[PDB]
Amino acid sequence: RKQISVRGLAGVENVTELKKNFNRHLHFTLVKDRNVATPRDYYFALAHTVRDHLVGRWIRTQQHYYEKDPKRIYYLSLEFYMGRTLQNTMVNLALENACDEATYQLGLDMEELEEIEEDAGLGNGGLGRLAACFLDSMATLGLAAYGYGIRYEFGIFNQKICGGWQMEEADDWLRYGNPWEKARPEFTLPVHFYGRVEHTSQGAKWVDTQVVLAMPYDTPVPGYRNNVVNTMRLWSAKAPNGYIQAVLDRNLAENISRVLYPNDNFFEGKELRLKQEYFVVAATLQDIIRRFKSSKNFDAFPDKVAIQLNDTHPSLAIPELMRVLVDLERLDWDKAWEVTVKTCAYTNHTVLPEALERWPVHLLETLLPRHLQIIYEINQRFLNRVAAAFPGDVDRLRRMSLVEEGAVKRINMAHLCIAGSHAVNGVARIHSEILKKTIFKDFYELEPHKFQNKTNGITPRRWLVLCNPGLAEIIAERIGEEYISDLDQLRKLLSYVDDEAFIRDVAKVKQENKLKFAAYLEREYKVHINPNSLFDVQVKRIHEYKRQLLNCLHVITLYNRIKKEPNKFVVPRTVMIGGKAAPGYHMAKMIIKLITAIGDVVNHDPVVGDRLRVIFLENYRVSLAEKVIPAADLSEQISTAGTEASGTGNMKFMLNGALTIGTMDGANVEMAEEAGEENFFIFGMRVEDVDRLDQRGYNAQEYYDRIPELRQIIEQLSSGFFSPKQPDLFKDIVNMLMHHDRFKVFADYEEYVKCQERVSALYKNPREWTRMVIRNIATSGKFSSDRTIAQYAREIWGVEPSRQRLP
Amino acid sequence: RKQISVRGLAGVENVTELKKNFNRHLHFTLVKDRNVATPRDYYFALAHTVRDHLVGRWIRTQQHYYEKDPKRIYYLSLEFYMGRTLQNTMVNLALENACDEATYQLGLDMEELEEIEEDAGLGNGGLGRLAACFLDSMATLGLAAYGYGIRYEFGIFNQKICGGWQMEEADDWLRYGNPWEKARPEFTLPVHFYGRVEHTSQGAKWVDTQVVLAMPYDTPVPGYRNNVVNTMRLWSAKAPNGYIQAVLDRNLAENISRVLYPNDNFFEGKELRLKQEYFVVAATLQDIIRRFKSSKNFDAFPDKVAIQLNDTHPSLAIPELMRVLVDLERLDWDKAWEVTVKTCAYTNHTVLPEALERWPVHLLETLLPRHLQIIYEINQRFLNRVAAAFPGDVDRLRRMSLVEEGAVKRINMAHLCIAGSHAVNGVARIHSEILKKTIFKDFYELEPHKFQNKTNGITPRRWLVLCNPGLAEIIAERIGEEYISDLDQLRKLLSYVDDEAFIRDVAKVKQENKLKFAAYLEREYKVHINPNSLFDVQVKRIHEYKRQLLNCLHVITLYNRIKKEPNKFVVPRTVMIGGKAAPGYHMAKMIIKLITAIGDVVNHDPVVGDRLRVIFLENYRVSLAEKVIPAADLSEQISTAGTEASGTGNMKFMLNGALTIGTMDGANVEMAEEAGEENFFIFGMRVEDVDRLDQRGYNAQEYYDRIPELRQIIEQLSSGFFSPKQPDLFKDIVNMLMHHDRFKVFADYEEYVKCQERVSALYKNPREWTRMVIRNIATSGKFSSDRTIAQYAREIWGVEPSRQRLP
Numbered sequence A, B: 001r002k003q004i005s006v007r008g009l010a011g012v013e014n015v016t017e018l019k020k021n022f023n024r025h026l027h028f029t030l031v032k033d034r035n036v037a038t039p040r041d042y043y044f045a046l047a048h049t050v051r052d053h054l055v056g057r058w059i060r061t062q063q064h065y066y067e068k069d070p071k072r073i074y075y076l077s078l079e080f081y082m083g084r085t086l087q088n089t090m091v092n093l094a095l096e097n098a099c100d101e102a103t104y105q106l107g108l109d110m111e112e113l114e115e116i117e118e119d120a121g122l123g124n125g126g127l128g129r130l131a132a133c134f135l136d137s138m139a140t141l142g143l144a145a146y147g148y149g150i151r152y153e154f155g156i157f158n159q160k161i162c163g164g165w166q167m168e169e170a171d172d173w174l175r176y177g178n179p180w181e182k183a184r185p186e187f188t189l190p191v192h193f194y195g196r197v198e199h200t201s202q203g204a205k206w207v208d209t210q211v212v213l214a215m216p217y218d219t220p221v222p223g224y225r226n227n228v229v230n231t232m233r234l235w236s237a238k239a240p241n242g243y244i245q246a247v248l249d250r251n252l253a254e255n256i257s258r259v260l261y262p263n264d265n266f267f268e269g270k271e272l273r274l275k276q277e278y279f280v281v282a283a284t285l286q287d288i289i290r291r292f293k294s295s296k297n298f299d300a301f302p303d304k305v306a307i308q309l310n311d312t313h314p315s316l317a318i319p320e321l322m323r324v325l326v327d328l329e330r331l332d333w334d335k336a337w338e339v340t341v342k343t344c345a346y347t348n349h350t351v352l353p354e355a356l357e358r359w360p361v362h363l364l365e366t367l368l369p370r371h372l373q374i375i376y377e378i379n380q381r382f383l384n385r386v387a388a389a390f391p392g393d394v395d396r397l398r399r400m401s402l403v404e405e406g407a408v409k410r411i412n413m414a415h416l417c418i419a420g421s422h423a424v425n426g427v428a429r430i431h432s433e434i435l436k437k438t439i440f441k442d443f444y445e446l447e448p449h450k451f452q453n454k455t456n457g458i459t460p461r462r463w464l465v466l467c468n469p470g471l472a473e474i475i476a477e478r479i480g481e482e483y484i485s486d487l488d489q490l491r492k493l494l495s496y497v498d499d500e501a502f503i504r505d506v507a508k509v510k511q512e513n514k515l516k517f518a519a520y521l522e523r524e525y526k527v528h529i530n531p532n533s534l535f536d537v538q539v540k541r542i543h544e545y546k547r548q549l550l551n552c553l554h555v556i557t558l559y560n561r562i563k564k565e566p567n568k569f570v571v572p573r574t575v576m577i578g579g580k581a582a583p584g585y586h587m588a589k590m591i592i593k594l595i596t597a598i599g600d601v602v603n604h605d606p607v608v609g610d611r612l613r614v615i616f617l618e619n620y621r622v623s624l625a626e627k628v629i630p631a632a633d634l635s636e637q638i639s640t641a642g643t644e645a646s647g648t649g650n651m652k653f654m655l656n657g658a659l660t661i662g663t664m665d666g667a668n669v670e671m672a673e674e675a676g677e678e679n680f681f682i683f684g685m686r687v688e689d690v691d692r693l694d695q696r697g698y699n700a701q702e703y704y705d706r707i708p709e710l711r712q713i714i715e716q717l718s719s720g721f722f723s724p725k726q727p728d729l730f731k732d733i734v735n736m737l738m739h740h741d742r743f744k745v746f747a748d749y750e751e752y753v754k755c756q757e758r759v760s761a762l763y764k765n766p767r768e769w770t771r772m773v774i775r776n777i778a779t780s781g782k783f784s785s786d787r788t789i790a791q792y793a794r795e796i797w798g799v800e801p802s803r804q805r806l807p
C-alpha cells in the first residue's frame, strides 16, 4: 500500500503538517469534532487540506504567465469529463503517500475517503474525456493553457438498471459542494441573446438584446510534479441584475447552464443547446480579449492567442470573434478575418453524418441575428475564393457552402469551422485521412495545408499511476519513474519479454486488480463474479456503430455451444458490458435490455454455472473506468471499420495490461502498428470491404441463410427465448439486424467468433498471454496525451512544450 | 475611533493573530494576493477571520446543551430580518477594536469594508426584525434557543426610486456567497405535499405525496460576551433524488424557498406561500422530534420543548405536531393534544383584519389533506369545550370556530393558534388588552389564563453599541458597561439631567451622527442636506395606517406657511421619509410618489431654500436604519390610535437620542409612561376617540370645511400643484382622504400641526431639547429585548434566563 515508491515520500514533517491542517479544516471549515464527524466530513477535510497545497503554485503559475507573456492556448469545449480530483491532485503534487500515512495515523482509510467524491461528469464520453486528458497534459507540458466550458449543475445522468432497463436520474454532483473550484463572481460577464441589428454611421450595432450573466468558476489543473497549476474556467448562468413570478422567471436564463445534453449522436437542433454554445463562446472570448489587452494593435492577436475548437460545438467563436473585432474594435473586415483564421483551429471528432451540427437559419436569425449576418458574409467571401480557385465548378460551390439549401435552410457548422480555421485535424490517422479523402475532400483540395492529423491520447497519470499503481510500480522498479511523463520509455519493457520476474509480476498485478474489482461488485451490488475467469470487457457509450450487439451475438454463441456440448472444456469468461444510452435513442435502450436479458438466461443455467457469466456494468463513468480497466483481460473494440474516429478506451486498456480484440478502425490501427499485429486480435472487414458491401448493397439475409449458428440466435431472439414473458420484446432489434443494419453486424459475425476462439486459445497459456501483454504495455507509449498535446503545440499552436519545473 | 472603550481591547497578540489569519484567508480562501485584491476580497478575508472566532464557542455551546439537556426553545418564523453580521459578531466577541487595529495596520479602513456586506434582508419590517432581536437576546440570556425559518434566495426587494416612483429589483444577497452560514446537506429532511389519506388498521396514512427536500443552513448567533453561540437554522428547498425538461422542472420544487413575499398586509391566499409555511413547519418539527429522542415517553415533550409561533405563519406546527404524534408515534388523540398545547405558544402581531390568514379549505384539502382532517377534529373538540362552557350560546360557537362559513369556506389560522397553544400574547400593553377585550374576547372568556402581554423590545447591541458607539461611549464613561446587557441601568442617567458635561456630550454625539449621515447621502446619492436643520424622520413600511400621508399634510403646511409669511423665522427642517411599499398596494405606491412630488416643489423653491427640505430615503432596510436613526432629532410615530400593535422603530429612536412625536398607540403609550408624558410629543385621538368617530361615522368633509389650511392643501393636490404635467395624478389619494379614509388622517391634522409647532419651539432651545433627550434615553431601558425575552422565558417557556459566562 504505502510501500509503493511512485506514490512519493511520507516526510515526517509533511505528515505532521497534513494531520494538523486536516484537523484544522474539520474544526474551522466543516465545524465538526471527531465525535460527530462522518466519512464524508473526513473526505472534505482531506480535500480542503490537499487543495491548500495547490494554491501557492496556482497563484505563481498565473502570475508567471502575466510576467513572461507566452502565447495563451484556449481550449473551448462544451464538455470536460474530469472524473474525481482528490487522488489526481495528490499524485501530481507527490502527496499521495504522505496523505495516506497522515490519514492512517488519524485512524482513517484514505481509499474509503476517496470513494466519497462525486465524479465531475461534465461530459458524455470520449470527447469530454479527451478534453480532460488534454488539460492534464498541457499543464504537464508547461503550456499557458486555459480550459473553457460550462459549469453544468447536472452532468451526465446517473444510470440505474431497473427490471433490466436503463433509468435516468439527475447527477446532482454539487449536492455537498465542490471543494476544488473557486467561484469568481467578481469576474462575471454579460452574454447577449436575441435582439436585432442596427446598421448606422459607425457600422453595425447589436441592440435590444436580452442579457444572461456568465459567472466563472475556476478549477486548478496540476501538471505532473512540475509546480505548474493551470486553470479550467467554467461559466455558470446567472439572471441579470407579478413580482413573485418575475423573480421565479430568473430560472429561465439560469437554465442555460442547468444540464448537459446526454445525446452523443443524432444532432437535435435544440435552442437551449444553441444558447449553451453561444454562452461559452461569448463569455470566453471576452476573457481572451481582456487578457490580450492587459498584456503589453490586433496584428499580434494570433501571436498571443490560440483558440482550439473541440468539435463544432464552440464554432460560434469564429463569427463572435469577427463580431467583436469588426463591430466593437472597429477593424476592417479583411484584417479581422486574417486575425480570426490565424487564431482559430478546429478538431473534428466523427464522420457519422447525424452527429454534424446544422442549425436552421431561422433559429440563428432570431437568437443571434448579427452572427447570422456575419456567417453569410463569411460564406460569400469563402465561396468567392472557391470560385476563383475552381472556375465554373458550380456543384463544388454547392457542396462547400456554409449554407445548406433544403426545405429548412441550415448553416453547416463544420464548413464554418474549416473556413474560419488555419488548421483542421482528425483524431486518428485513418480518420484524418478519410477527412481529406471524402468528407472534406473539396476543402482539402482548396487548402491542403490546413488539414492535419493529431492521433488521440490518454494521460498516463490518471490512466496508469492513479488507477493502476501496482502496474506503475513494477514498471518503475525496472525503468525508473521518468516514463510517467515520457511514456515512450515503456519500450524499454520489451527487454523483459523473457524475464521470469517481470512475467510473474505483470500476471500478479492483473490478478490483484481482478480481485479488487470482484470485491467492488460484491460490496456495492452483491454481484459475484468468478475471479478465475477471463474478464471480457466492452465499456463505452451504447451505440449501434460500436456494436455491443455483435458482442451479444458472440455471448449467445458461447452459451449455445456450451449447451450443445456441455462436456467440452471452454475457458471460463466473465463478459462485462457497460455504458450509457442516450435517453431518446430507442435501439440503444433496447440493446441494454438485451444484455441484461441474455444474462437472465445464461447466469441461471445450471449447465453453464461459472463457465460463462454476462453482466451489465451499471453507471459506467470515469471513476468506474478507473476500476474496471485495470482488471480487464480482453478489451472489446469492435466498431464497424470506418465508424470510430479514434477511440480512447482502447488506449486505456492497452496501457493497463489487457489484450485487444478489434477491427481495423480509428486508433486501433495505430495501436496494432505500434505493438505488431501479431500482438493484437484483429478481425473483420477493413474500410475497403465495408465500402465494397455498400457498393453492391448489404443483404443481412445472406449471412442468416449461410450461418446455422447465427440463424439459431436470431430465432431465439425472435421467438422470445430471451423474453419468455414478452415473446416479441426484441422484434425491433431483429428487424434492424435483418433489414436496416447500417453497421453490418452479421458481416463480421464469423470472423469475430473465430477471432474470439483464438483469444480463448491464448488464455489457456498463461505465460504466452502475459508475454503478449508485455508486448502491448511496452508499445502503448505513443498513446500518451503528452505526445498528442506536444503535436498540437508544435504543429498548430506554434508553442514549444517544456517539462521544466517551476520554483 | 479606536479610543472607544466599549469596543474592547486591541491586544498585541490578538492584533498579530488577526492580521495573520486575515492574510491566510486572502491566500488560501480567496486565492488572491495584495496585487489584485479588491475591497470586497478584504471584506471577505475579515469576515472569514472573524467567523473563525465563533467556531469553538459554537461547537461548545451546542455540546453543552446536549450534556446539560435544558428545555429547548424553538422560535419559528417565516422572517429573520438579520441585517449585516460582521460588526455584530465583533461587538459580541469583544473583537471590534482589535480588528479595527489589525485592518489599520494592514492599511485598510474596517468601516469601508463593513459597507461591502449585504443585509440578510429575510424580513419585511418589524416582525422580521423582532425575530432577529429575539435571537440576539436569547443567546445573551443563555437560553438553549433555536431560530427556525426559510433561507430565501431573495429577501425583501431592493427599492429603486425612478421618476419619483418605487421600482423593485431582486435582492440577490447571496451573489458573492454568505461567509456566516454553514450548509448542512447531510442533515437534509423530506417534506411532503399533496397526496391523500388512507385510513387503515394501524390508523391514518398520508400516501402518494410529492416530496421536497429541506436542506438546513446554520448561522451562528453570538450572545453578548458570554461565550454563548446559538444557531439560526434556515431551510432551503431542494428537488428530491423529456429528460431535459424533467431536470429543468426541478426548479418548481426549489421555488419554495426562492423569494420572500413582500406584502406585509392584505393577506393573499397564495399556494406558494402556504407551501413555504408548511415547508418550515414540517422540516423544523422533524428536527425537534429527533433532538427530543436523542436526549435521554412523549409525556416529557413539553418539559423539553417549547415552540413559539411568530404570528400565524407557522401555525401549521399545531396540526403537524398532532399528525406526527398520532399517525407516526401512535399516541392517542387526547395525549397528543395535551402535549401539543403545552408545547405551543402563539404571538399575535396585529389587529388589522386584512392581515389575518384565512386559508380556503379546498386549498388545504388538496395540498395538505391530513392536516385539514386534523384541523376539523381539533375544531370539533374545541367547540365541544365552548359548548360545555357556554351552553346554548350558538353565535359564540360560530364566532369561535376554526372554520369560517362564507362563499369560500376557510380556516382561521389565528383561531387554530389559540386553540392549540397554552399561551397567547400581544406585543404591547394596549394591543394585548384589545385582544382580550374585542378581537379574541370569546377566547379570553373561555381561557383567560392563556392570554398574556409581552411588550416588544430591541437589542441594545445592534441598536446602540453598533449603530451609535459615540452615544454608547459617553454613557459608559458615566455608568460603566453593565447597561449593555442590563439596559434598565440607563435610569442612572437621570442623575445627569443638569450635568453640563453630559448635556454637552449628548448634543455633540447627535451632531456627529448628523454629519455622518449627511456625508452618507452626499457620498452615495449626491444629495445635500442642511446639517443645521432638525432631522425629522419617519422610517417604516409605507402604510395607510402608519399615516405617512399625515406627515405629507404637515410638510405641505410648513411650505404653505413659509410662502404666506416668507419673513417669519421657522426652525429649519430636513423631513426624511423612507420605507418600502408592497408591490401590489396601489395607495402605498402613490404615497411614495407624493413624497417625491412634494420634494420636487419644496426643494426647488428659492423662497424656501435650506429652511425646508423633503427627501425620500431610498431602500430603507436594517443597515440604513443603523445609519439614520442615530442621526434623527424627531421620531415620527403617528399611526391612528389602535392600529400599530407595538412598533419597534419607536424604541430605536428613543434609545438613540431622538424625541418622539406620536399618538397614544402601541408601545408609544408605554414609552411615554416610562419617560413621563411631559417628555413626549403626544397628540391626536386616543383609541376611545377613534371609536366614538366610528360610532357616528367619519366624515372627512367636515374637517375640510372647517380647516382653511387643510382645504388649501387638498386643492393643491387636486388641481395638480404637485404634478403640473399630470394634474390628476393624485386624484386617488384625494378621493381616499375625502371619502374612503379608514385611518382618519384629517381628524388628527390640527392637533398634529399644533404639536409640531411645539417641537419647533423646543428645538429653538438647544439646552432644553437636550435635557428632554436625556430624560428619554435614560428611561428607554424597559424596551430592551432582553427584558422582553426574560418575560417570554419565565412566563411562557418556563425557563430561567442567565447572563452567566461559558468557559
Ligand SMILES: O=C(Cn1cc(-c2ccccc2)nn1)N[C@@H]1O[C@H](CO)[C@@H](O)[C@H](O)[C@H]1O
Residues within 6 Å of the ligand: A125, A126, A127, A130, A261, A263, A264, A265, A266, A267, A268, A311, A349, A350, A354, A355, A356, A427, A456, A644, A645, A646, A647, A648, A666
Ligand atoms: O464524441 C464524439 C463526437 N460528438 C458528437 C456529439 C454529438 C452531440 C450531440 C448531438 C449529436 C452529436 N458529441 N460528440 N466523437 C468521439 O470523439 C472521441 C475523441 O476524439 C473519439 O475517440 C471517438 O472515436 C469519437 O466517437
Ligand SMILES: O=C(Cn1cc(-c2ccccc2)nn1)N[C@@H]1O[C@H](CO)[C@@H](O)[C@H](O)[C@H]1O
Residues within 6 Å of the ligand: B125, B126, B127, B130, B261, B263, B264, B265, B266, B267, B268, B311, B349, B350, B354, B355, B356, B427, B456, B644, B645, B646, B647, B648, B666
Ligand atoms: O408585521 C406584522 C404582522 N404581519 C402581517 C403580515 C402579513 C403578511 C402577508 C400578508 C398579510 C399580512 N406580516 N406580518 N406586525 C407588526 O409586528 C411588529 C412586531 O411585533 C409590531 O411592532 C408592529 O406594530 C406590527 O405592525
